[PDB]
Coordinates of C-alpha atoms in Angstrom, one line a residue:
Chain R
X1 CA 54.0 106.1 92.3
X2 CA 56.4 105.0 94.6
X3 CA 58.7 102.5 94.2
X4 CA 59.5 101.7 97.7
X5 CA 57.0 101.5 100.5
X6 CA 56.7 102.2 103.9
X7 CA 55.7 99.1 105.8
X8 CA 56.2 100.8 109.3
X9 CA 58.8 102.0 111.6
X10 CA 61.1 103.1 108.5
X11 CA 61.2 99.5 106.8
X12 CA 60.8 99.6 102.8
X13 CA 59.6 96.7 100.1
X14 CA 59.9 97.5 96.6
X15 CA 56.4 97.9 94.9
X16 CA 57.3 95.9 92.0
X17 CA 58.4 92.8 94.2
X18 CA 55.0 92.2 96.1
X19 CA 52.6 89.4 94.9
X20 CA 50.1 89.8 97.8
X21 CA 49.3 91.9 100.9
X22 CA 46.9 89.6 103.2
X23 CA 45.5 89.5 106.8
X24 CA 47.7 87.0 108.7
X25 CA 44.3 85.3 110.5
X26 CA 43.9 82.4 108.1
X27 CA 45.5 79.2 108.5
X28 CA 46.9 79.1 105.0
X29 CA 48.6 82.4 105.5
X30 CA 50.0 81.1 108.9
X31 CA 51.6 77.7 107.2
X32 CA 53.4 80.3 104.7
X33 CA 54.7 82.4 107.6
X34 CA 55.8 79.2 109.5
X35 CA 57.4 77.8 106.5
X36 CA 59.2 80.9 105.6
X37 CA 60.5 81.2 109.3
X38 CA 62.1 77.7 109.0
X39 CA 63.7 78.3 105.3
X40 CA 65.0 81.5 106.9
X41 CA 62.7 83.5 104.5
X42 CA 60.8 85.5 106.9
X43 CA 61.1 89.5 107.4
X44 CA 59.7 90.5 110.7
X45 CA 59.1 94.3 110.1
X46 CA 56.7 94.9 112.6
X47 CA 59.0 96.4 115.5
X48 CA 57.6 94.8 118.1
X49 CA 54.0 95.2 117.4
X50 CA 51.0 93.1 116.0
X51 CA 51.1 91.9 112.8
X52 CA 48.4 93.1 110.7
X53 CA 49.8 92.3 107.1
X54 CA 51.6 89.6 105.1
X55 CA 53.5 90.9 102.1
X56 CA 54.3 88.0 100.1
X57 CA 57.3 88.8 97.3
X58 CA 58.0 87.0 94.3
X59 CA 61.2 85.7 95.4
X60 CA 59.3 83.6 98.3
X61 CA 60.2 86.2 101.0
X62 CA 57.3 86.8 103.6
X63 CA 57.4 89.8 105.3
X64 CA 55.4 90.7 108.3
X65 CA 54.1 94.3 108.8
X66 CA 52.2 96.1 111.4
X67 CA 50.5 98.2 109.0
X68 CA 46.9 96.8 107.5
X69 CA 47.1 95.4 104.2
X70 CA 45.3 97.9 102.3
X71 CA 47.1 100.9 103.9
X72 CA 50.2 99.1 102.6
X73 CA 48.9 99.2 99.1
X74 CA 47.7 103.0 99.5
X75 CA 51.3 103.7 100.6
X76 CA 52.0 103.0 96.8
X77 CA 51.0 106.6 96.5
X78 CA 52.4 108.1 99.3
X79 CA 49.8 108.1 102.1
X80 CA 47.8 105.9 104.2
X81 CA 44.8 107.0 102.1
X82 CA 43.5 106.7 98.4
Chain C
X1 CA 45.1 101.1 85.8
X2 CA 45.6 100.1 89.6
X3 CA 48.8 97.9 90.2
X4 CA 46.8 96.3 93.6
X5 CA 43.5 95.1 93.5
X6 CA 41.6 94.5 96.5
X7 CA 40.2 91.2 96.3
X8 CA 37.7 91.4 99.0
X9 CA 38.1 93.0 102.8
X10 CA 41.6 94.4 102.9
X11 CA 44.0 91.9 100.8
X12 CA 45.8 92.7 97.9
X13 CA 46.9 90.7 94.8
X14 CA 49.0 92.7 92.3
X15 CA 47.6 92.7 88.7
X16 CA 50.8 92.2 86.9
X17 CA 51.0 89.0 88.7
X18 CA 47.7 87.3 88.2
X19 CA 47.6 84.2 85.7
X20 CA 43.9 83.6 85.6
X21 CA 40.9 84.0 87.7
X22 CA 38.2 81.5 87.6
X23 CA 35.1 80.2 89.7
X24 CA 35.8 77.3 91.7
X25 CA 33.1 75.1 90.2
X26 CA 35.0 72.3 88.7
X27 CA 37.0 69.3 89.9
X28 CA 40.5 70.9 88.4
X29 CA 40.4 73.8 90.1
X30 CA 39.4 71.9 93.4
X31 CA 42.6 70.0 92.6
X32 CA 44.5 73.2 92.3
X33 CA 43.5 74.7 95.7
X34 CA 43.7 71.4 97.8
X35 CA 47.4 71.0 96.0
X36 CA 48.3 74.6 96.8
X37 CA 47.1 74.1 100.3
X38 CA 49.2 71.0 100.9
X39 CA 52.4 72.7 99.8
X40 CA 51.8 75.8 101.3
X41 CA 51.3 77.9 98.4
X42 CA 47.6 78.7 99.3
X43 CA 46.4 82.2 100.5
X44 CA 42.9 82.2 101.8
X45 CA 41.4 86.1 101.6
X46 CA 38.2 85.2 101.8
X47 CA 37.2 85.8 105.6
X48 CA 35.7 82.6 106.0
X49 CA 33.1 83.7 103.1
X50 CA 32.1 81.2 100.4
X51 CA 34.9 81.4 97.4
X52 CA 33.9 82.8 94.4
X53 CA 37.3 83.4 92.5
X54 CA 40.4 81.1 92.5
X55 CA 43.3 83.4 91.6
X56 CA 46.2 81.8 90.3
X57 CA 49.6 83.9 90.2
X58 CA 52.8 83.3 88.4
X59 CA 55.0 81.7 91.5
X60 CA 52.0 79.1 91.9
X61 CA 50.5 80.7 94.8
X62 CA 46.8 80.4 94.6
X63 CA 44.6 82.6 95.9
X64 CA 40.9 82.2 97.1
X65 CA 38.5 85.3 97.0
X66 CA 35.2 85.9 98.1
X67 CA 34.5 87.9 95.2
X68 CA 33.1 87.0 91.7
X69 CA 36.2 86.7 89.0
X70 CA 34.8 89.5 86.8
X71 CA 34.2 91.7 89.5
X72 CA 38.3 91.0 90.3
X73 CA 38.9 92.1 86.6
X74 CA 37.2 95.5 86.8
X75 CA 38.9 96.7 90.1
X76 CA 42.1 96.7 87.6
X77 CA 40.4 99.9 86.6
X78 CA 38.8 100.9 89.5
Chain B
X1 CA 44.1 96.4 75.0
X2 CA 42.5 94.5 77.5
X3 CA 44.8 93.4 80.1
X4 CA 42.5 90.3 81.3
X5 CA 40.3 88.4 78.6
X6 CA 37.0 87.1 79.5
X7 CA 37.3 83.6 78.5
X8 CA 33.6 83.0 79.2
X9 CA 31.3 82.7 82.4
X10 CA 33.3 85.6 84.1
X11 CA 36.5 83.4 83.9
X12 CA 39.5 86.2 83.3
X13 CA 43.1 85.2 81.8
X14 CA 45.7 87.6 81.7
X15 CA 46.2 87.8 77.9
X16 CA 50.2 88.7 78.6
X17 CA 50.5 84.9 80.1
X18 CA 49.0 83.4 77.0
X19 CA 50.9 81.1 74.7
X20 CA 48.9 79.7 72.5
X21 CA 44.9 79.4 72.2
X22 CA 43.8 76.2 69.8
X23 CA 41.2 73.9 69.0
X24 CA 40.8 70.7 70.9
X25 CA 40.5 68.8 67.8
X26 CA 43.8 66.9 67.6
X27 CA 45.7 64.4 69.8
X28 CA 48.4 65.9 70.8
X29 CA 46.5 69.1 72.8
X30 CA 44.5 65.8 74.4
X31 CA 47.7 64.7 75.9
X32 CA 48.3 68.2 76.8
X33 CA 45.0 68.2 78.6
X34 CA 45.2 64.5 80.3
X35 CA 48.7 65.7 81.5
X36 CA 47.8 68.7 82.8
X37 CA 44.7 67.0 84.6
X38 CA 47.2 64.4 85.8
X39 CA 49.7 67.2 87.4
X40 CA 47.1 69.4 88.9
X41 CA 47.8 72.0 86.2
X42 CA 44.4 71.8 84.4
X43 CA 41.8 75.1 84.9
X44 CA 38.1 74.3 83.8
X45 CA 36.4 77.3 82.7
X46 CA 34.0 75.9 80.8
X47 CA 31.1 75.7 83.1
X48 CA 29.9 72.7 82.0
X49 CA 29.7 73.4 78.2
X50 CA 31.7 72.1 75.1
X51 CA 35.3 72.9 75.2
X52 CA 36.0 75.3 72.3
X53 CA 39.5 76.4 72.8
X54 CA 42.6 75.4 75.0
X55 CA 44.6 78.3 76.1
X56 CA 48.1 77.2 77.4
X57 CA 49.6 79.9 79.5
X58 CA 53.7 80.1 80.3
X59 CA 53.4 78.7 83.8
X60 CA 52.2 75.2 82.1
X61 CA 48.5 76.1 83.0
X62 CA 46.0 74.8 80.6
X63 CA 43.0 76.6 80.6
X64 CA 39.7 75.0 78.9
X65 CA 37.4 77.4 77.2
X66 CA 33.6 77.5 75.9
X67 CA 34.7 79.9 73.9
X68 CA 36.4 79.4 70.2
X69 CA 39.9 80.4 69.9
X70 CA 39.6 83.5 67.4
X71 CA 36.8 84.9 69.7
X72 CA 39.7 84.5 72.6
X73 CA 42.0 86.7 70.7
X74 CA 39.4 89.2 69.4
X75 CA 38.3 90.0 73.2
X76 CA 42.0 91.4 73.7
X77 CA 40.1 94.6 72.7
Chain U
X1 CA 51.0 95.2 65.1
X2 CA 49.1 92.2 66.9
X3 CA 49.9 90.5 70.0
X4 CA 48.2 87.1 68.8
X5 CA 49.4 86.0 65.3
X6 CA 46.7 83.6 63.4
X7 CA 48.7 80.5 62.3
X8 CA 45.6 78.8 60.4
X9 CA 42.0 78.1 61.1
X10 CA 41.6 80.7 64.0
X11 CA 44.3 79.0 66.3
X12 CA 46.2 81.8 67.8
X13 CA 49.9 81.9 68.7
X14 CA 51.2 85.1 71.1
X15 CA 54.1 86.8 68.5
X16 CA 56.3 87.5 72.0
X17 CA 56.6 83.7 72.7
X18 CA 57.8 82.5 69.2
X19 CA 61.4 81.9 69.1
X20 CA 61.5 80.7 65.6
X21 CA 59.5 79.5 62.7
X22 CA 60.7 77.1 60.4
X23 CA 59.9 74.5 57.5
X24 CA 59.6 70.9 58.5
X25 CA 61.6 69.2 55.9
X26 CA 64.9 68.9 57.8
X27 CA 65.8 65.8 60.1
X28 CA 66.8 68.0 63.2
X29 CA 63.4 70.2 63.1
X30 CA 61.5 66.7 62.6
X31 CA 63.4 65.4 65.9
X32 CA 62.6 68.6 67.3
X33 CA 58.5 67.4 66.6
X34 CA 59.1 64.0 68.0
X35 CA 60.4 64.8 71.3
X36 CA 57.5 67.4 71.5
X37 CA 55.2 64.6 71.0
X38 CA 56.7 62.4 73.5
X39 CA 56.9 64.9 76.1
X40 CA 53.2 66.1 75.6
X41 CA 54.8 69.7 74.4
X42 CA 53.5 69.4 70.9
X43 CA 50.5 71.3 69.5
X44 CA 48.7 70.2 66.1
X45 CA 47.2 73.2 64.5
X46 CA 46.8 72.1 60.8
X47 CA 43.3 71.1 61.6
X48 CA 44.1 68.0 59.4
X49 CA 46.4 69.6 56.6
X50 CA 49.8 68.9 55.8
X51 CA 52.3 70.9 58.0
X52 CA 53.9 73.7 56.4
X53 CA 55.7 75.8 59.6
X54 CA 57.0 74.6 62.6
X55 CA 56.7 77.3 65.5
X56 CA 59.2 77.1 68.4
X57 CA 58.1 78.8 71.5
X58 CA 60.0 79.8 74.8
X59 CA 58.3 77.5 76.9
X60 CA 59.5 74.4 74.6
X61 CA 56.1 74.0 73.0
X62 CA 56.2 73.1 69.3
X63 CA 53.3 74.2 67.2
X64 CA 52.4 72.8 63.9
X65 CA 50.6 75.4 61.6
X66 CA 49.3 74.7 57.7
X67 CA 50.7 77.9 56.6
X68 CA 54.2 78.8 55.6
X69 CA 56.6 80.4 57.8
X70 CA 56.7 83.8 56.2
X71 CA 53.2 84.1 55.9
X72 CA 52.9 83.1 59.8
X73 CA 55.4 85.8 60.3
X74 CA 53.6 88.2 58.0
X75 CA 50.6 88.1 60.2
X76 CA 52.0 89.8 63.0
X77 CA 50.3 93.2 61.7
Chain E
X1 CA 63.0 97.4 63.0
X2 CA 61.8 93.6 62.3
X3 CA 60.7 91.5 64.9
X4 CA 61.0 88.5 63.1
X5 CA 64.1 88.0 60.8
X6 CA 64.2 86.3 57.6
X7 CA 67.4 83.7 57.7
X8 CA 67.0 82.4 54.2
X9 CA 64.0 80.3 52.4
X10 CA 61.3 82.0 54.5
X11 CA 62.4 80.5 57.7
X12 CA 62.2 82.7 60.6
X13 CA 63.9 84.1 64.0
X14 CA 62.5 86.4 66.5
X15 CA 65.2 89.2 66.9
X16 CA 64.8 89.4 70.2
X17 CA 65.7 86.0 71.0
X18 CA 68.9 86.4 69.3
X19 CA 72.2 86.2 71.7
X20 CA 74.6 85.8 68.7
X21 CA 75.1 85.2 65.2
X22 CA 78.1 83.8 64.0
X23 CA 80.6 81.8 61.3
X24 CA 81.0 77.7 61.3
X25 CA 84.3 77.7 61.0
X26 CA 86.1 77.6 64.5
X27 CA 86.0 74.3 66.7
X28 CA 83.9 76.0 69.6
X29 CA 80.7 76.5 67.5
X30 CA 81.2 73.1 65.6
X31 CA 80.8 71.6 69.1
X32 CA 77.7 73.6 69.7
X33 CA 75.9 72.6 67.1
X34 CA 76.7 68.9 67.4
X35 CA 75.7 69.2 70.9
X36 CA 72.7 70.7 69.9
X37 CA 71.7 68.2 67.4
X38 CA 72.6 65.3 70.1
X39 CA 70.3 67.5 72.6
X40 CA 67.2 67.7 69.9
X41 CA 68.1 71.8 70.3
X42 CA 69.4 72.3 66.8
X43 CA 67.2 73.8 63.9
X44 CA 68.5 73.4 60.2
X45 CA 67.1 76.4 58.2
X46 CA 69.5 76.1 55.2
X47 CA 67.3 74.3 53.0
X48 CA 69.6 72.0 51.6
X49 CA 72.4 74.8 50.9
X50 CA 75.7 75.6 52.8
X51 CA 75.9 76.7 56.4
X52 CA 77.0 80.2 56.6
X53 CA 75.7 81.4 60.0
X54 CA 75.0 79.7 63.4
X55 CA 72.3 81.7 65.3
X56 CA 72.3 81.0 69.1
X57 CA 69.2 81.6 71.1
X58 CA 69.1 82.4 74.5
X59 CA 66.7 79.1 75.1
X60 CA 70.0 77.3 74.1
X61 CA 68.3 76.7 70.5
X62 CA 70.9 76.6 67.7
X63 CA 69.6 77.7 64.0
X64 CA 71.7 77.0 61.1
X65 CA 71.3 79.5 58.5
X66 CA 72.6 79.7 54.5
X67 CA 72.9 83.8 55.1
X68 CA 76.2 85.3 56.2
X69 CA 75.8 86.5 59.9
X70 CA 76.1 90.0 59.1
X71 CA 73.3 90.0 56.5
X72 CA 71.1 88.3 59.4
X73 CA 71.9 91.1 61.6
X74 CA 71.0 93.7 59.0
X75 CA 67.9 91.9 58.0
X76 CA 66.6 93.3 61.5
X77 CA 66.0 96.6 59.2
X78 CA 64.4 94.8 56.1
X79 CA 67.5 94.6 53.7
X80 CA 70.7 92.3 53.2
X81 CA 72.6 96.2 53.5
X82 CA 72.7 98.4 56.3
Chain W
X1 CA 65.8 109.0 89.9
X2 CA 69.0 107.0 90.6
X3 CA 69.7 103.7 89.5
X4 CA 72.2 103.2 91.7
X5 CA 71.7 104.2 95.7
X6 CA 74.7 105.3 97.8
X7 CA 74.2 102.7 100.8
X8 CA 76.8 105.0 102.8
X9 CA 80.6 105.1 102.2
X10 CA 80.5 105.0 98.2
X11 CA 79.2 101.5 98.2
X12 CA 76.3 101.2 95.8
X13 CA 73.4 99.0 95.3
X14 CA 71.2 98.7 92.3
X15 CA 67.5 100.2 93.4
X16 CA 65.9 97.9 91.0
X17 CA 67.4 94.6 92.5
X18 CA 66.3 95.4 95.9
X19 CA 63.2 93.8 97.2
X20 CA 63.4 95.1 100.9
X21 CA 65.2 97.3 103.2
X22 CA 65.1 96.5 107.0
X23 CA 66.0 97.1 110.5
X24 CA 68.4 94.2 112.1
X25 CA 66.4 94.2 115.1
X26 CA 64.6 90.9 115.0
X27 CA 65.2 87.4 115.1
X28 CA 64.2 86.4 111.6
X29 CA 66.3 89.2 109.8
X30 CA 69.3 88.3 112.1
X31 CA 69.1 84.4 110.7
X32 CA 68.6 85.8 107.3
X33 CA 72.1 87.6 107.8
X34 CA 73.8 84.4 109.6
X35 CA 72.4 82.2 106.5
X36 CA 74.0 84.7 103.8
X37 CA 76.9 84.8 105.9
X38 CA 77.6 80.9 106.0
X39 CA 76.8 81.0 102.2
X40 CA 79.3 83.5 100.7
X41 CA 75.9 85.9 100.1
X42 CA 76.7 88.4 102.5
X43 CA 77.8 91.9 101.6
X44 CA 79.3 94.1 104.5
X45 CA 79.1 97.7 103.4
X46 CA 79.3 99.3 107.1
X47 CA 82.8 100.3 106.4
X48 CA 83.3 99.3 110.4
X49 CA 80.2 100.8 112.2
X50 CA 76.8 99.7 113.0
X51 CA 74.3 98.2 111.0
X52 CA 71.2 100.2 110.7
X53 CA 69.8 98.7 107.7
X54 CA 69.5 95.1 105.9
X55 CA 69.2 95.3 102.3
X56 CA 67.7 92.0 100.5
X57 CA 68.5 91.8 96.8
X58 CA 66.7 89.4 94.3
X59 CA 69.8 87.2 93.6
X60 CA 69.6 86.5 97.7
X61 CA 72.4 88.5 98.4
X62 CA 72.1 90.4 101.8
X63 CA 74.0 94.0 102.1
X64 CA 74.6 95.6 105.3
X65 CA 74.6 99.5 105.3
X66 CA 75.4 101.8 108.4
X67 CA 72.5 104.2 106.8
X68 CA 68.9 103.5 108.3
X69 CA 66.3 102.1 106.0
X70 CA 64.1 104.8 105.2
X71 CA 67.4 106.9 104.2
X72 CA 68.1 104.1 102.0
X73 CA 64.9 104.4 100.2
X74 CA 65.1 108.2 100.2
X75 CA 68.5 108.2 98.3
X76 CA 66.5 107.0 95.2
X77 CA 66.3 110.4 94.2
Chain J
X1 CA 71.7 102.1 69.2
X2 CA 72.3 99.1 67.6
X3 CA 70.9 96.1 68.9
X4 CA 73.6 93.9 67.5
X5 CA 76.9 94.7 67.5
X6 CA 79.9 93.6 64.9
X7 CA 82.5 91.8 67.2
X8 CA 84.8 91.4 64.6
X9 CA 84.3 89.7 60.9
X10 CA 80.7 89.6 60.6
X11 CA 80.4 87.8 64.0
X12 CA 77.3 89.5 65.8
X13 CA 76.4 90.0 69.3
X14 CA 73.1 91.4 70.9
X15 CA 74.2 94.0 73.1
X16 CA 71.1 93.4 75.9
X17 CA 72.8 90.0 76.2
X18 CA 76.4 91.1 77.1
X19 CA 77.0 91.3 81.1
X20 CA 80.8 92.3 80.5
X21 CA 83.6 92.8 78.0
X22 CA 87.2 92.5 79.2
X23 CA 90.6 91.8 78.5
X24 CA 92.0 88.4 78.5
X25 CA 95.2 89.3 80.3
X26 CA 94.3 87.7 83.8
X27 CA 94.2 84.0 85.1
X28 CA 90.4 84.4 86.3
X29 CA 89.3 85.4 82.7
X30 CA 91.2 82.4 81.5
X31 CA 89.5 80.0 83.6
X32 CA 86.4 81.3 82.3
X33 CA 87.3 80.7 78.8
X34 CA 88.8 77.1 79.4
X35 CA 85.1 76.3 81.6
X36 CA 83.3 77.6 78.8
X37 CA 85.1 75.5 76.2
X38 CA 85.1 72.4 78.1
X39 CA 81.2 72.8 78.4
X40 CA 80.5 74.1 75.2
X41 CA 79.7 77.4 75.7
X42 CA 82.4 79.0 74.3
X43 CA 82.2 81.0 70.9
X44 CA 85.2 81.9 69.3
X45 CA 84.8 84.9 66.7
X46 CA 88.6 85.7 66.7
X47 CA 89.1 84.1 62.8
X48 CA 92.1 83.1 64.3
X49 CA 93.3 86.3 65.3
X50 CA 94.6 87.1 68.8
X51 CA 91.9 87.6 71.3
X52 CA 91.5 91.2 72.6
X53 CA 87.9 90.8 74.4
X54 CA 85.9 88.3 76.3
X55 CA 82.2 89.0 75.9
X56 CA 80.6 87.2 78.9
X57 CA 76.8 86.9 78.3
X58 CA 74.0 85.9 80.2
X59 CA 73.6 82.4 79.3
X60 CA 77.2 81.5 80.6
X61 CA 78.0 82.1 76.8
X62 CA 82.0 83.3 76.4
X63 CA 82.5 84.9 73.0
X64 CA 86.1 85.5 72.0
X65 CA 86.8 88.9 69.8
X66 CA 89.7 90.1 67.9
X67 CA 88.9 93.7 68.8
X68 CA 89.9 95.8 72.1
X69 CA 86.7 95.8 74.8
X70 CA 86.4 99.5 74.6
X71 CA 86.1 99.1 70.7
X72 CA 83.0 96.9 71.2
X73 CA 81.3 98.9 73.4
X74 CA 81.7 102.0 71.1
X75 CA 79.9 99.7 68.5
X76 CA 77.0 100.4 70.5
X77 CA 76.4 103.6 68.6
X78 CA 77.8 103.2 65.8
Chain Q
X1 CA 72.3 106.9 80.5
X2 CA 75.4 105.0 79.7
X3 CA 74.3 101.0 78.9
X4 CA 78.1 99.9 79.2
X5 CA 80.0 101.4 82.1
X6 CA 84.4 101.5 81.8
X7 CA 85.2 100.2 85.2
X8 CA 89.1 101.1 84.3
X9 CA 91.5 100.3 80.9
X10 CA 88.8 100.0 78.6
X11 CA 86.8 97.1 80.5
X12 CA 83.2 97.2 80.4
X13 CA 79.9 96.3 82.5
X14 CA 76.8 96.5 81.5
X15 CA 75.2 98.8 84.2
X16 CA 71.6 96.8 84.0
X17 CA 73.2 93.8 85.3
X18 CA 75.0 95.1 88.5
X19 CA 73.5 94.3 91.9
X20 CA 76.1 95.8 94.1
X21 CA 79.7 97.7 94.1
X22 CA 81.5 98.0 97.0
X23 CA 84.9 98.3 98.5
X24 CA 86.9 95.0 99.0
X25 CA 87.1 96.2 102.8
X26 CA 85.3 93.4 104.7
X27 CA 85.5 90.0 105.3
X28 CA 82.1 89.0 103.6
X29 CA 83.3 90.5 100.1
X30 CA 86.8 88.4 100.4
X31 CA 84.7 85.2 100.9
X32 CA 82.7 86.4 97.4
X33 CA 85.6 87.0 96.2
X34 CA 87.4 83.7 96.7
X35 CA 84.4 81.8 96.1
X36 CA 84.1 83.3 92.5
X37 CA 87.5 82.4 91.8
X38 CA 87.1 78.8 93.0
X39 CA 83.7 78.7 91.2
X40 CA 85.2 80.1 88.0
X41 CA 82.9 82.9 88.1
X42 CA 85.7 85.9 89.0
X43 CA 86.7 88.5 86.5
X44 CA 89.8 90.2 87.5
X45 CA 89.8 93.8 85.3
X46 CA 92.2 95.9 87.5
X47 CA 95.1 95.4 85.1
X48 CA 97.6 94.2 88.0
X49 CA 96.4 97.7 89.6
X50 CA 94.2 97.6 93.2
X51 CA 91.3 96.3 93.7
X52 CA 89.2 99.2 94.7
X53 CA 85.6 98.1 94.1
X54 CA 83.9 94.7 93.9
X55 CA 80.9 94.6 91.3
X56 CA 78.6 91.7 91.7
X57 CA 76.5 90.9 88.5
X58 CA 73.3 89.4 88.5
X59 CA 74.9 86.2 87.0
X60 CA 76.8 85.5 89.9
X61 CA 79.6 86.9 88.2
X62 CA 82.2 88.8 90.5
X63 CA 84.3 91.6 88.9
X64 CA 87.1 93.4 90.5
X65 CA 87.8 97.1 89.4
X66 CA 90.7 99.5 90.2
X67 CA 88.0 102.2 89.9
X68 CA 86.6 103.2 93.3
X69 CA 82.9 102.4 93.7
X70 CA 81.4 105.7 93.6
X71 CA 83.1 106.3 90.5
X72 CA 81.8 103.3 88.7
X73 CA 78.4 104.3 89.3
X74 CA 79.4 108.2 88.5
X75 CA 80.3 106.8 85.2
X76 CA 76.8 105.9 84.2
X77 CA 76.4 109.0 82.5

């Protein structure tokens, strides 16, 4: 198992700190993103590409990834695939 | 045991962070959902399909899932 | 050991998050239930059936079960 | 080792969440009970019988048991 | 190792929750006792006997024991002696 | 596995306290840096060189490293 | 490894609860002691003898010991 | 692995409580030192010798060491 997960373009997240990884489509997750953007808890790791996963950490940080949600989770074991 | 659980579509939840997984059929759980919506703690992972399970995590996040609660808990092992 | 306990009708609780499971038979736990209801911390998982166990979690959530307390704790295995 | 201890009549307490288990025979503990009662943090698991143990958990819940402290702690196994 | 320690007359304390066990003689510990007595965090487990150890737990509870401090600690392994 | 990671020039970070390590190339991260600077929570470990990684720890400390994120995470071993 | 450490006389400290053990020879540590005294977080286990070590635990308790810091840390193993 | 690290002159820190060990060479860490001094969170363990490492603990304590950061982390073993 990987302690740090690559969420795209070299950016890393500690697996032990993730609560949930989800699609950005719905309105509750978009409110969460905007609240984080406003409280300075948002991390944008998409490197300009399109957001495909929103990672919520236990410290109310919100991390935007260009990698799809389950691919992020799969990377806990080293590949995009499980 | 999996540490991340697919709760429907590609949405993942860390199993260690779950307090309870329940059906949304009662007034108290509905109050919990509305409260989480209003405070920016709701996560909706149903992709529009009907809510079958409500997952309460430990940071007071509430996650709506389209999968039955018992099916969510079995995915801990596969 | 089961990490999630079935508390009736497919509703699940994480065993590690339980503080106490008790009968709903006393004034203090009923004050705990009504407080949870007013504060939006109550979870009713009885599926319309008697409350036979009150589960208090470490987040001040209060979960009503149709299964009796010792039965809940025995389903840990 | 049990994760859940039967504190009498099928009422369960999580052993890891217990701070101390004491007899209810002193003024400081009785104030702890009264405070818990007023704050909605008291749980009464004595099923109508005399209190022989007061269990303090880490969430400042206070749980009354009809079983003496030593017997509560011995049921960990 | 004992998970619950007998601090005298059947009263039990969880070993994992103790921060410190100390003699009651000095003025800083007596202030701690009186503050706990006033905030309802004091537990008197001496069963009327003389206080010989003050146990401080991680939740700011203060527990008075009739057993001497190192005897309390020794009881982590089952006897008054190590 | 190392408990402490060298983030450059002999500066050490505890691997278990890291939440995320990211590049400093986006507006949201730069605000995180500026907030940390104003709050006395910023640590600058770049020894005078360009920032290539921003490490967020669980105590909301923010630590600037002259080493890219992937290289920081790879030094766990 | 011991989980309880004799810090002098019969006074015990849980090793897992210690943040740091230092000599009291500097102004900052003295401020920490006075602050703990005033807030009811000081524990004095020196039995009057001179303070050789200051033990900062994780609930902001400060414990004065009559034993040298390094001697306190070796008693973790004996 | 050593549970306590000697940071110079017998002063000890618990390795599990360290967030980061860094050189005192930048404006942000000096703001962290002075804030700790004003708030009563500073611990000076240099024994009157140069500060060569600043150790930030998870309780917002700040510990000044005469030993260089990488040396502190190497004494973990």
